[PDB]
């Protein structure tokens, strides 16, 4: 299977900022990639469209994917409330890495983070499943609205999302 590509159209307080696209590593983690893909297309009747990045730490990562509570306490997977760590074949190698947020082992939901740095200390604890293809500059632009404690100065939003290929 060819690795699928998804896009996020980002908005800052409603104003369009730009598009970020991701390659999803379905050749390593097909279940984890499939969950993110479907949530990006909304094909199950729910997903990332209109959701926010609740926690952004400059020099670290942008966290989003909580489309039910919008604060880190919510979201769900297409398989149910949570699913297992598929594997840890892939590592947090640098900026642009796409990885699953969790609340400890085997609690993957819908929450994810886009790395803006190498996050090696997270290897083996968080399932890496994708990488930014185009629009890393948009991620960099998103980053400036975060803070050391994660709170964002403006509402950073996924205005639209879907699958490109």
């Amino acid at each position: 299977m060819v690795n699928p590509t998804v896009f996020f159209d980002i908005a800052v307080d409603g104003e369009p900022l730009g598009r970020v696209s991701f390659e999803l590593f379905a050749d390593k983690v097909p279940k984890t990639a499939e969950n993110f893909r479907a949530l990006s297309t909304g094909e199950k009747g729910f997903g990332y469209k209109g959701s926010c990045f609740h926690r952004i730490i400059p020099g670290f990562m942008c966290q989003g994917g909580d489309f039910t509570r919008h604060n880190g306490t919510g979201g769900k997977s297409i398989y149910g409330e949570k699913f297992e760590d598929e594997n840890f074949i892939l590592k947090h190698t640098g900026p642009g890495i796409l990885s699953m947020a969790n609340a400890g082992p085997n609690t993957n939901g819908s929450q994810f983070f886009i790395c803006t740095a190498k996050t090696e200390w997270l290897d083996g604890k968080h399932v890496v499943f994708g990488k930014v293809k185009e629009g890393m500059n948009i991620v960099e632009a998103m980053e400036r609205f975060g803070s050391r404690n994660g709170k964002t100065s403006k509402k950073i939003t996924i205005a639209d999302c879907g699958q490109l290929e």
Binding site: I57, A101, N102, A103, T107, G109, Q111, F113, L122
Partner: peptide, 11 residues
């Protein structure tokens, strides 16, 4: 610290 967690955010 620098974690990415869902619910209980730690240092």
């Amino acid at each position: 610290x620098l974690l990415v967690x869902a619910g209980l955010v730690l240092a």
